[PDB]
Amino acid sequence: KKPHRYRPGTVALREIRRYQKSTELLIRKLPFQRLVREIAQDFKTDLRFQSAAIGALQEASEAYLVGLFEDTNLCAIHAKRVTIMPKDIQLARRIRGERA
Amino acid sequence: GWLKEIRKLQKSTHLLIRKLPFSRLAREICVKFTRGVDFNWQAQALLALQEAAEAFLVHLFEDAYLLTLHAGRVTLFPKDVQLARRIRG
Amino acid sequence: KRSRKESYSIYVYKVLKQVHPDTGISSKAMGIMNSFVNDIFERIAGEASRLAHYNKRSTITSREIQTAVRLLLPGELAKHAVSEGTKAVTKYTS
Amino acid sequence: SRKESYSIYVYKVLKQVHPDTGISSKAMGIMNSFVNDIFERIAGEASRLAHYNKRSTITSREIQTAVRLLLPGELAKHAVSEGTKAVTKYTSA
Amino acid sequence: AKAKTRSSRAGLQFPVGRVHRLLRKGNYSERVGAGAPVYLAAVLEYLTAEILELAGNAARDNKKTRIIPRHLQLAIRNDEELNKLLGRVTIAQGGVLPNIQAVLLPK
Amino acid sequence: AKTRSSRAGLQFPVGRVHRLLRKGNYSERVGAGAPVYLAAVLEYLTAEILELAGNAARDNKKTRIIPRHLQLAIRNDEELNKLLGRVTIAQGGVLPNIQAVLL
Amino acid sequence: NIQGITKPAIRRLARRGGVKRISGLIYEETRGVLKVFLENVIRDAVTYTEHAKRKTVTAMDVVYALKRQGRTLYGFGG
Amino acid sequence: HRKVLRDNIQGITKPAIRRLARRGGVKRISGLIYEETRGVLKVFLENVIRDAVTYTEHAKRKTVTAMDVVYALKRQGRTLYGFGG
DNA sequence: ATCAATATCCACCTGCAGATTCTACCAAAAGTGTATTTGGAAACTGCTCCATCAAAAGGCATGTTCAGCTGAATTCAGCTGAACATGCCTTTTGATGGAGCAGTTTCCAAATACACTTTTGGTAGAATCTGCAGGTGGATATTGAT
DNA sequence: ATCAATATCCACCTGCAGATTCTACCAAAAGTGTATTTGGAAACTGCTCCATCAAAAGGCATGTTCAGCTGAATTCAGCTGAACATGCCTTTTGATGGAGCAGTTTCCAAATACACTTTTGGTAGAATCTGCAGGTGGATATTGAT
């Protein structure tokens, strides 16, 4: 008997459906806290944080990245590709106003 | 041919749509929105409106053209303009 | 020795019970609602403030509120908002 | 009729940074727009700052934080320097 | 003499007196007319009514009796106008609308 | 008698900036140093733009600054450009820019 | 009446945008896009006119309309 | 009085970034978008946190509140709902 | 066309974390009366603005070749998705205090109020000059044939 | 590359019309000086929450292998959009008034502000209440290879 193996893209589409169905945060909480605190620390030392401040930052960051991934994928599909590439993010951010 | 045209129009700053067609369209649109009134227009209102509209179209053409070149083309397609309009939100 | 935080919660809940009597609302969703009310409040009041300033008037009247609402809401939403605000004002003055 | 404007001061500043150069009446219109715009951004932000902190006065401190929030870095540095410098100069003589 | 609130006088659930105070305290104008807080409170209450309407719908299609942020996101984003009005707004815990570009499906 | 602009070392009008702060519905009260600070910031940004704009005007060997020069100066400066990124300058045109792929 | 926005005019606009070649269907798309833009701005500007109890659209009306849609115009009084 | 925080943008793992791209409807992912995403996320957090910390400093506080972040988000055109009460 | 192999859907169930209701206190709205302000209602003017109406300048509409590009077909290397085991580090829940946010209270450096006087900035015509409508003419591209 | 031949590009020029500056005048604004008030800073403190440590369970990140299929490169054809010359109709440019209508100016009933006092409606903590999260297990796909 042969081991069962889905084709490249079956599991991907399964995950698109799954996470587009859900709303939980997709970055781990503690790595994200360390990131936020490190950046803040570089602006002003010895800062504290309400837990809801970190939560707000994660909700905004994740919403922003999901949306930029949307536009990135539109750009990839425009160049007759299915794979998103760095040039796609750069172009999407550029058209959005963030760059160049 | 096309290069000279691009260099020349990018070196200039004059309005590129002729005034009477533009103002006719602006007043027509106004009358449509306002349910059919008789609204007057300062000359400077129409010139401001045309400065805004032309700058908007020129910049949308820059963005749309980046999508054009992203697709390996140099012909700007309608779907280039609408994708740019979508990504600007 | 106790803080006092105001909020739109009781009124969001009153309206909720009127449009959906069987339905409740999680506190996070209520937070989204309070965020929304404060947001539209400052958008409308801000626009009305600019309107009174542009016309050299020092009073913000329901007229400036009305123009701010027409300027800010997409059509239909703006119409129905105008209906309910006008109706509330005319009812109020009697 | 009486329309006020920043033209006198944009012309003074121009004369001090480039005494040789002049300015079109339209370019003056652009400058006056720029000043009105930045004024309304900085004052608007200062008002939000005082309100968030339950303050009723807009002080040079609210102006400074507003400038920090609104200008891209460096531009903000020199603005903060010029404003602080102007205030300390004003408060003595 | 017996007290009647301006909310009752206007026929509203949202608090007219509170809205009026917030207009005074916000430095929007030197003076505030009597009808401005009524109109403003009414507009807010209407838009709230309109979002709670659609989101309650979403909660019942999902066989839930309590509205959660996801229902607000579904209601706002699936309504063209609520979506234009809150187009630069993020709903915490709201997720996104299901949407797979066709080109990505198998063929 | 000398004006507050003179006392603070400024060309921009402190008294006017102060009145516009009072009349603009920004706060109940306005401190003495707020209009001085604000007027100074404004004169600085104006000085920066008139600087670069005179530069651009003379690189086209013109003696008078027109909107075109303001547009060139603002857009060729990363910071002036990001600060005025949602602003259209009437009669300014655009920056000469042809994508390389077209050459 | 929207056809008064001619093909050579739109070509001019795209040339200033650095476009080398233009599909033949870009004139209709450009006219529709311009139509939505003008609709939005003109709606807001005329609203500013009506509130001021004027029957003449001033340049300032248009400037306010542009500013509140995040499209600040310099050179017309604001 | 806590271990130095270094290089934490690498805690934003490859699978988390993939999950984000899935919610964005992305089916296939170039091997270099993880670094690109980390750089974009870092500039985003730098901008928001910078402004929020400025609001903290101006209120003479040593604690970043949710309101500080909400204000930072609003003035960068990215209004967040659900964190003001 | 058919199965094996996986996944997803879906209905049902309980108790407990999270939502709803209950209850008193009190801060803030409402009621009252008087002081202060305002934005139209009505009656002045000069200016842009539009309707013609007009005469033309010049920019566009039109239809053919053709030259270059867009899209289709194809091919292959190698990159990225799928499915593993492995083990570490995130999550969860609670402790251990301490910092610092938030609440009072007091009182002056800083703000407003107000009656005057001194300057200023805006304005309009006169007196100055800068730009540009056009006209070069040689450089600087482009196109074609060796 | 080389010319060769053309076709615009781009500095560079005049002189003079129309844009900018110069010169005075003056209401409106800024400044001044004096008096009086007060927002908010500082110096307390009470008590939320925040930080940081720990351990345990296990969920999930990591690094591997490896092959399917994607992107990238290529080739070629056919069809689209650019480059032309031409004359004609739409747009420009110029008054002529007339008139509409935007601004002002003064006054005053209707409106708004505000301190005081009376009353609730709104909140916080506490007491109830109960939706649904997470846990099954079996149906119904859906997928991929024989």
Numbering used by the authors:
A (entry chain E): 36 to 135
B (entry chain A): 46 to 134
C (entry chain D): 30 to 123
D (entry chain H): 32 to 124
E (entry chain C): 12 to 118
F (entry chain G): 14 to 116
G (entry chain B): 25 to 102
H (entry chain F): 18 to 102
Excerpt from the paper describing this PDB structure:
The histone octamer, containing two each of histones H2A, H2B, H3, and H4, left-handedly wraps about 150 base pairs of DNA around itself in the nucleosome. Similarly, in human cells, CENP-A overexpression can lead to its ectopic localization to chromosome regions with active histone turnover, as shown in cancer cell lines. At these ectopic loci, CENP-A forms heterotypic nucleosomes, containing one each of the histone H3 variants, CENP-A and histone H3.3, within a single nucleosome24.
In the present study, we report the crystal structure of the human CENP-A/H3.3 nucleosome at 2.67 Å resolution. This CENP-A-specific αN structure is perfectly conserved in the CENP-A/H3.3 nucleosome, in which the CENP-A αN helix is one helical turn shorter than the H3.3 αN helix. The CENP-A/H3.3 nucleosome generated a biphasic histone dissociation curve, and the first and second Tm values (70–72°C and 82–84°C) were very similar to those of the H3.3 nucleosome. As anticipated, only one CENP-C bound to the CENP-A/H3.3 nucleosome (lanes 3–9), while two CENP-C peptides bound to the homotypic CENP-A nucleosome (lanes 10–16), and no CENP-C binding was detected with the homotypic H3.3 nucleosome (lanes 1 and 2).
